[PDB]
Design a protein around this ligand. Sequence first.
Ligand SMILES: *C/C=C1/C(=C/c2[nH]c(/C=C3[NH+]=C(/C=C4\NC(=O)C(C=C)=C4C)C(C)=C\3CCC(=O)O)c(CCC(=O)O)c2C)NC(=O)[C@H]1C
Ligand SMILES: *C/C=C1/C(=C/c2[nH]c(/C=C3[NH+]=C(/C=C4\NC(=O)C(C=C)=C4C)C(C)=C\3CCC(=O)O)c(CCC(=O)O)c2C)NC(=O)[C@H]1C
Lengths: 485, 484
Amino acid sequence: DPLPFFPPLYLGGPEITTENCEREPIHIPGSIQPHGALLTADGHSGEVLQMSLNAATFLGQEPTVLRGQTLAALLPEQWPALQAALPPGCPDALQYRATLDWPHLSLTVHRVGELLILEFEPTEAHALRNAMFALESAPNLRALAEVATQTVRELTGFDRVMLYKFAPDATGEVIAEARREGLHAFLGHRFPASDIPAQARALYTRHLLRLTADTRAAAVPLDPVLNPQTNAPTPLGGAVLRATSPMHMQYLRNMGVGSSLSVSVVVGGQLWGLIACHHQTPYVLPPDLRTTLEYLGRLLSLQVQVKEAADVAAFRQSLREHHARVALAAAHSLSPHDTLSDPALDLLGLMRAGGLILRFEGRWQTLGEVPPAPAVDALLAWLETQPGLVQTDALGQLWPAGADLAPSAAGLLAISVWSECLVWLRPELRLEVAWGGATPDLGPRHSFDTYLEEKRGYAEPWHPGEIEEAQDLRDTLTGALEHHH
Amino acid sequence: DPLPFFPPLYLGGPEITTENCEREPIHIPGSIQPHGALLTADGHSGEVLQMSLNAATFLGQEPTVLRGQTLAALLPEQWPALQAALPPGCPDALQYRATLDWPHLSLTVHRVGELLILEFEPTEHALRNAMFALESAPNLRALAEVATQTVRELTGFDRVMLYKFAPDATGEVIAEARREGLHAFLGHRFPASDIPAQARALYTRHLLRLTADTRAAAVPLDPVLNPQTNAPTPLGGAVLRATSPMHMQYLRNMGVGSSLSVSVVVGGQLWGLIACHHQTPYVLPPDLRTTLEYLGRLLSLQVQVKEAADVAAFRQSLREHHARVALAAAHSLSPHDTLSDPALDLLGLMRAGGLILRFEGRWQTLGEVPPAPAVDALLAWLETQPGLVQTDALGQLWPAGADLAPSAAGLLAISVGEGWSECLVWLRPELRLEVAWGGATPDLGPRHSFDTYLEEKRGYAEPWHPGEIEEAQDLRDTLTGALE
Ligand SMILES: *C/C=C1/C(=C/c2[nH]c(/C=C3[NH+]=C(/C=C4\NC(=O)C(C=C)=C4C)C(C)=C\3CCC(=O)O)c(CCC(=O)O)c2C)NC(=O)[C@H]1C
Ligand SMILES: *C/C=C1/C(=C/c2[nH]c(/C=C3[NH+]=C(/C=C4\NC(=O)C(C=C)=C4C)C(C)=C\3CCC(=O)O)c(CCC(=O)O)c2C)NC(=O)[C@H]1C
């Protein structure tokens, strides 16, 4: 549920700063980048309605001349096959493409609702093949990543290439970095969510590619801006040539980036990460090379979807011997305290939690480094109010009085069998983030160097297998409840 | 857990028929197809050990001459970059490739354990626009027929089919792009045996294999046994591998000169094949083969999105009925008199013809159900069954269940109380399903008949949709919570 957008600047809407850029209508700029021209057309008749101001440059004849022509006349040879590709009411993620001649031009076309949007830019006319196999036999998330980043750099010759992966909190972390020997190294830096805003993420989920060929160049509006059909903003998301919002363009200039590009790494209908890549000088990429990345980006999604899902399963098997023992031993004895209390079962080693607490039929029993008694009892009280299995790396944030006595009471992992329940406390960790410029709030920042922060109150993150293995026990444990009741 | 294989024919092993072809060592033929030559080499030194007999044809100099050369000498220009691609102890699913010159030759190389295996054969906006039609393909079928059509348009095959497997290792051709004139397999289930145990396992790892000429004979090696081990050579990763003669007759018996297929694999499991045949002999350029290999792995990533989504859209169609039955069940003490009410539409949730309810001794029924003394015996068996029981044919999971088929055919059972004191069940009536085999399903050798065989199996019932199976378990979580 991302925020709904304001009207644009060219329709009496407000102007942009840090506060309101969350709700910016990026998809309707009414303008494009100069490196290529752009025409719209009527869905049914094929009449050309809107043209770019620079439509006389690539085509070779003025906007006033062609503002009213029909595609049957202008593109007589393409128009027959073109319509067969783009049927009425289809998605906008469908792109037909062919090469053209003029006294060459690569042509990208798509359809949104009832309006056809054409794209025009030049074309010059075993890399990915061998690469694709190194992706297959890449033994883990990281190996994949660095092999993947390296591949894009070798193929496109960028000055920088990074594999940005997002987080649960919309932030990210550059996990892999192929770059020029000389440039600053972002590798291993978390950037805040705000750097890629709410709607941008949602637009990159549907459309898998966008770029900026020249950061300093100015935009080129349309003729007219409003779609004569609707008399309203034009949906330009599916177009490569879309005008990148000025906010981000300064963000790019403030790093020192002439040409930028990125590709969507999407898995399970959700924007998982980006392949970020920057150049120094202005750089217009041939359509062939852009398509080669678009294969590699969707390809790279299918590997993550296999490399993540597998790398947890291999960890899952490492903690199923301890699960096997605790399955049988728990189902035997009447005493629920005096079975799980025993260090033979290694009830701490299953989670690697610094402390634990056990509650069964009134008695509260503890083991490991745990807070004092009057503290614990108040911690029991809150867990009774909490609905639903509770898990957090910072208890202080989910409970204000929990930030107290941090040495022991920092992290947490709770499960219910709240009369008879389990819990695993975790000690405080002095984690040290690596932001690329700080995380508090003027405009877009000029500092992008290695900022640290030493946030206290947070603890070691629970691994996907450590979260799930606990729930597997919850199924088999509650089944042994009836032997008492 | 597939069957372990016999030794080959060229090492004193037994010969092949229908009975024993399940345990055939297809991966070690010790021979290849003539359309391209094949050389092995030492992993460390790069010395050439084994050569094909026809290695003098493409290369241009005899086997006796080069049987003992080193790759530093033979391929001086490739050898440096080649080793960097294939590090020691890597997987065999890694293929380096470059183009060559001779007084042209595409070169495919891979590494298994400690032996390098080279492959040699000639070389002379389609996939781009296609790839997008895959994205906006609205469903499993639309995807399929668009996908099959694409391969046919791209390769110009006489036939192209999207074979999808089943839980029972059978399949069903669900899409078919073909020449106007050829017999239509579209919609035909073939039995599991047609693609055997190990073959499926070998197509999981290696995503492509072919046959460029069905009638042509194989070309052995020189020597057959790997001088390193003195043992069979692993040729699975090679495109040029000799297709086992059994299948080659199976292909001839349909009337297929050139065949090819690509693995559609999802979640580490062989989901389906893109089957494609030609009439005349057909050696495909390596470029075109690679284009399919993109499209096949690509097509895997779309199924993994199109299946997983198309169930979620169905799941939402039966969560209003779930929402009502969540609240109404948690209210009343009477478990019978709440779920008995036709207001809750407890039949409409599953669309089951009949149901039965058991709670605290009382057995209550609704819908077309079998007579009382029958039901009571059906209760007895469910108490013996461990674990949630589901089957489209109860007769197969319970011999006395095949009786009284009109009502007692299909089944879907769930437990609330541990054991079977308080539990649910949904019976389903018998369905006269009509299969479309491409030649019959009983057991000489490989069959000559591939026409449209039907069977009218009685005892089976409508299959439970993935959402209908899961929605019932979602209720089981929320229902048992109202037991206390
Ligand atoms: C308050 C407004 C802000 C501005 C908004 C903004 N930014 C984008 C597009 C991107 N921002 C990105 C952030 C990064 N750039 C990097 O180089 C790295 C890491 C090395 C990060 C984390 C990225 C990657 C993009 C995508 C575009 C691209 O890669 O070239 C938009 C949407 C632009 C559009 O296409 O419509 C907006 C509105 N940026 C801010 O940080 C805040 C202050
Ligand atoms: C007793 C042994 C038998 C033999 C088993 C067998 N099958 C294969 C490989 C394949 N079999 C296939 C069967 C089909 N081809 C189709 O076109 C359709 C449906 C339209 C089916 C069900 C297919 C597709 C393959 C993959 C190769 C291909 O044809 O593209 C092998 C292994 C051969 C090899 O790769 O070396 C073996 C041993 N087939 C039988 O039917 C039984 C008699």
